[PDB]
């Protein structure tokens with residue numbers, strides 16, 4: 001079977017940067033910021049990039065055991081691998097795969113099973129991926145919990161992400177910052193083996209973003225989350241692994257209700273999408289609409305305005 | 307004849323996801339299932355890509371709930387009147403047992419409720435647990451109740467989401483008596499009959515048992531039974547749905563291959579109605595190479611004799 005994209009509606013698909021479903025399509029200018037997400041990065045021939053991995057549910061999860069920090073409700077987690085094996089920090093990846101690729105305060109729950117009797121406990125925890133001690137690359141991250149005693153040492157402990165939070169004493173929606181990369185090895189360290197930043201070069205083109213709204217758990221957070229590729233596309237390319245004939249796969253978005261092509265876009269072989277539009281726009285689509293790969297084209301093909 | 311050739315994805319067990327809870331697959335397990343009914347509504351799909359029961363494509367959506375909430379005064383418990391997944395009105399005339407991705411087992415599912423106030427975008431998040439065994443658990447009728455850690459914080463008439471994390475045990479001193487993964491909830495509440503169910507599955511061929519794709523649900527309190535078995539990995543459901551390869555016969559013969567040795571560890575029967583059986587007798591945890599994966603080799607008849615594993 002030749003190269004293609006799956007027949008999945010936007011709503012039927014999942015965000016590749018957080019374990020939540022896609023809601024809509026959004027385009028806007030990106031010269032004011034850097035677009036360098038590490039999750040949801042995959043070439044059209046199925047080469048995973050950055051911290052990208054196949055499991056949607058594992059995105060922004062952490063695993064390991066925890067050590068309580070006295071005089072606080074904070075626990076340091078010495079990370080294990082996703083399969084509960086030892087973590088190796090010599091792997092040529094920016095951070096353990098599925099690590100958050102944005103600076104924010106991610107709230108969820110820590111859970112733990114005592115091996116001997118199978119007793120369990122669960123508590124609310126938040127991780128500040130902006131914090132100097134956020135060093136998943138070195139196998140350590142800290143969690144702000146509401147307990148100073150319940151978690152036992154040397155037991156398997158999991159973090160399941162739920163949403164994000166904001167400090168309401170400050171300017172609203174100032175956090176999280178989705179386009180700011182964390183320092184995976186902690187403050188004053190340089191990230192390594194990154195998926196490259198993407199920017200539109202062709203005139204009149206903006207990125208097409210696959211947008212979700214992260215749940216907010218406290219305050220006034222910026223809950224917009226844009227991924228370059230839906231998680232399903234990442235899984236699909238990895239499975240198909242169809243080599244790219246050219247730099248760009250021309251895609252058409254089809255409307256089943258009318259039968260006509262609503263808009264067309266450029267799927268770049270390194271794994272991102274551009275459309276011909278100028279300004280901030282939320283795309284209004286038929287909910288049963290879907291993408292279809294029509295042709296291999298070069299980078300400087302001229303898209304019809306949308 | 308000459309129809310599109312059926313296949314399964316080249317995915318390791320570890321690379322895949324549980325179809326009954328938003329967690330990764332860990333292991334393969336086989337055991338006897340004559341003592342109970344195997345009738346999960348999640349992770350049900352024919353090999354030709356027809357979704358069954360409460361099954362839907364997104365793993366993250368499994369065991370989630372959406373809607374607005376009404377406080378029960380003088381308590382930390384909230385009733386949720388369910389909305390659709392895309393925040394539209396819930397429709398109870400749909401020919402489905404329950405809202406898609408609804409939990410298909412009786413248990414106490416703990417996670418977090420989150421809510422956004424539309425006017426100013428203020429947000430709140432609290433730990434909540436839902437008892438799918440409870441008499442008032444009627445997701446089919448657009449209602450679920452949550453035991454929360456707040457007695458005031460949630461506003462009415464705002465979009466509210468439940469994100470599942472794991473399961474809990476309590477109300478008893480007996481360990482691992484709950485949850486009960488093979489007990490279907492009464493989707494319309496107690497003393498009501500479930501409808502449009504995916505059918506129960508049982509091994510028919512002599513000496514054969516079901517093959518289970520097993521995960522360990524996180525435990526958030528007490529001593530719960532955290533074993534979770536799905537008939538189909540979520541990715542297989544996603545795969546079959548996309549490919550929609552017609553079934554030549556009742557059964558697709560699968561071989562589990564070891565890349566390290568190059569040989570076949572074991573073979574199994576993938577029934578076109580969407581479940582797997584192997585030739586083994588008794589409870590068994592499969593010891594597999596972590597890079598091992600399934601491969602469809604041939605269509606065989608229903609009464610084919612599997613190599614013992």
Ligand SMILES: C[C@@H]1O[C@@H](O[C@@H]2[C@@H](O[C@H]3O[C@H](CO)[C@H](O)[C@H](O)[C@H]3O)[C@@H](O)[C@@H](CO)O[C@@H]2O)[C@@H](O)[C@H](O)[C@@H]1O
Pocket residue numbers: 167168169217218219220428429430431456459
């Ligand atoms: C914007 C505000 O955010 C959330 O509240 C937290 C505060 O939490 C506390 O007060 C809220 C009610 O406002 C509620 O009683 C909660 O149980 C309690 O912890 C507090 O953590 C501050 C600290 O700066 O941050 C937020 O204001 C949320 O619960 C509120 O509903 C509201 O959205």
